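Fill-in record for Bromodomain-containing protein 1.
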Amino acid sequence: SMEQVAMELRLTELTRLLRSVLDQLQDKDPARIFAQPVSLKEVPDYLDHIKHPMDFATMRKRLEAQGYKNLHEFEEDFDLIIDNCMKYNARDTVFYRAAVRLRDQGGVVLRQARREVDSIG
């Protein structure tokens, strides 16, 4: 139908805007701490600690499959990256500190993305 097509064009454009958001967030992680899944070869007990692992490569796969229906779903995944790290790692680690900086800097990007998604519909 024409409506399914129009809905599909909306999802495509949301995907384009979320791709730009993802790029901006990932630039706030210049050390690439959050770029890939935590390795289960190198942290074999990780899933005993963290029940829903997340990372930027995994978000990018979901994004390119148009698997984010709205900004809320995309933010959920970004928040997992941060919140998993802040639980698994102690306060005095480069990992935790990187997550806090990513959260603080990403807030700005996500604040305007919410306005853009609301604005363009």
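KEY FINDING: The radius of gyration is 16 Å.
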